[PDB]
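Troubleshooting log. The previous run stalled partway through. Resubmitting the same four chains, unchanged.
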Amino acid sequence: TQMVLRAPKRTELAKDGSYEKWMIEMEVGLRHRNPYASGVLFTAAG
Amino acid sequence: DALASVDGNNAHVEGSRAEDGEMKPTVIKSNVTQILRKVVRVSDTANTTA
Amino acid sequence: NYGRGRELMYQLEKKGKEIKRDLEKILLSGQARTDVLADQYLTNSAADPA
Amino acid sequence: LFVSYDQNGKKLSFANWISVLSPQDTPFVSMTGKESINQTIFSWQT
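Second attempt completed without errors. Output:
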């Protein structure tokens, strides 16, 4: 269940002269209810 | 126009003020037309014959 | 331009899609931990800015 | 840097809906049957 605190927004960045900047934000987050509930299998040859 | 390449691992400080980020422009793909022609010439006697 | 009425919204949609892809990639990446910028979390009372 | 992680409050919220389902029923061992006795030892004949 990927939990997003800050949804994608749109704002302006620091001074940029006449560049007319734009910036989008977010907040990375992921929760795993129980570790052994999901498994992983890496690849390897003989 | 395509999008950016594989992103990720671009860890940056909150107040880093990145270098305006990157991006890629578009591309123009041009072609050309072609003319197809067909001629026909028939006499009036042959146009009237049954 | 011809195929673009305005560049700002175009680049904004491009960046939205790019950040979505970046998130989906980083959430399924496999790199290791690298000493998070924290200041001895779990009683990090004495922070260390600068 | 100024990570700005001071936030002496530290609400420390947690998400509801644990959604735990791991069962360990083993019914057949509860259905094989049961017989009451009155001694610590039981003997049968063959």
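Takeaways: The two ends of chain C are 46 Å apart (CA to CA). DSSP finds one helix and no strands in chain C.
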